[PDB]
């Protein structure tokens, strides 16, 4: 509740297992 | 500097 | 941001506004790092050569934003200032070396759907994504062309986001006359790369993040610092390195509790 224990997993996203439309594009630059 |  | 692109809702969730009070005008944009404290660039509180020298009252933030324009109701938040650090070692004089600040909130803001904080990178995941090539994201408010004010004291209705891949150093440094120091890193396409992007007028301070594979948490890399014009071929964007002054970081926070 202060940050850091859940920081940067987003409540619309991570934590609902959902991915946004262009995060895709990071993970492949980070592999290929 | 030089900030936009 | 040029060339980027509508953000999704609670895509960005520790994206940060920072406004002057008297006249109301969007300044810089900011990071949530936790419910108290605020991640910026250097510059946008403090550069002499544009009498700009910011004291706490004279600012506010809002977070939770996602139009430019339109009060979201029970979505966005207003936050006051309490104390605003600057880095001491913080060079304006020349290249904005060390171009990074921390504002303390007067008030813990309640984190939500759409306020969330991001993620300080450790060395792990500094030196596992820092790399020439790996993309990153920016975030922010900005101009969606280079104008004339540009480097000198149209506009989204909803925050933009672009990718950006981060560049090899030497090609930064060839790119541009000023110094560049390793407390800085540079991003954006090349020329024959064909893809575009990059921030512009008031998307400084922004985050540059970059999201882990490891433990899937969005680490922020960079602060949106300088750049020669908007978008540009051949010039890219300038980042505040956030891990090489994390030492900062940690210990002005620590002496007034995160
Ligand atoms: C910035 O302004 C404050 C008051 O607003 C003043 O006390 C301080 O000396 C100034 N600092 C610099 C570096 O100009
Ligand atoms: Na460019």
Same mark, same amino acid.
């Given at each position: 509740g202060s940050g850091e224990a859940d920081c940067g997993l987003r409540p619309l996203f991570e934590k609902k297992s959902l991915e946004d439309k262009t995060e895709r594009e990071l993970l492949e630059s980070y592999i290929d | 500097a030089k900030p936009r | 941001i040029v060339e980027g692109s509508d953000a999704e809702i +609670?895509? /960005?969730?520790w994206q940060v506004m920072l406004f002057r009070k008297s006249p109301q005008e969007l300044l810089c944009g900011a990071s949530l790092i936790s419910d108290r404290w605020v991640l910026t660039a250097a510059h946008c509180l403090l550069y002499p050569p544009w009498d700009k020298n910011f004291t706490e009252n004279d600012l506010l933030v809002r977070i939770?934003?996602? /139009? @430019?324009? @339109?009060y979201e109701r029970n979505i966005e938040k207003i936050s006051m200032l309490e104390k605003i650090y600057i880095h001491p070692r913080y060079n304006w004089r020349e290249n904005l070396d060390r171009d990074i600040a921390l504002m303390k909130l007067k008030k813990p803001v309640a984190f939500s759907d759409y306020i969330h904080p991001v993620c300080l990178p450790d060395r792990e995941t500094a030196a596992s994504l820092l790399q020439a090539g790996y993309k990153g994201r920016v975030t922010g408010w900005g101009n969606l062309k280079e104008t004339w004010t540009a480097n000198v004291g149209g506009q989204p209705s909803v925050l933009q986001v672009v990718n950006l891949p981060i560049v090899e150093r030497p090609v930064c440094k060839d790119s541009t006359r000023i110094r560049i120091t390793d407390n800085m890193f540079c991003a954006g396409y090349k020329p024959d790369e064909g893809k575009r992007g990059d921030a512009c007028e008031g $998307? /400084? +301070?922004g985050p540059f993040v970059m999201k882990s594979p490891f433990n899937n948490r969005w680490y922020?890399?960079?602060?949106?610092s300088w750049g020669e +014009?908007? $978008? @540009? $071929?051949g010039k890219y964007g300038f980042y505040t390195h956030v891990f090489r002054l994390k030492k900062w970081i940690q210990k002005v926070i620590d002496q007034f509790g995160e």
């Open positions: - | - | +609670g895509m /960005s969730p939770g934003k996602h /139009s @430019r324009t @339109r $998307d /400084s +301070g922020q890399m960079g602060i949106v +014009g908007c $978008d @540009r $071929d």
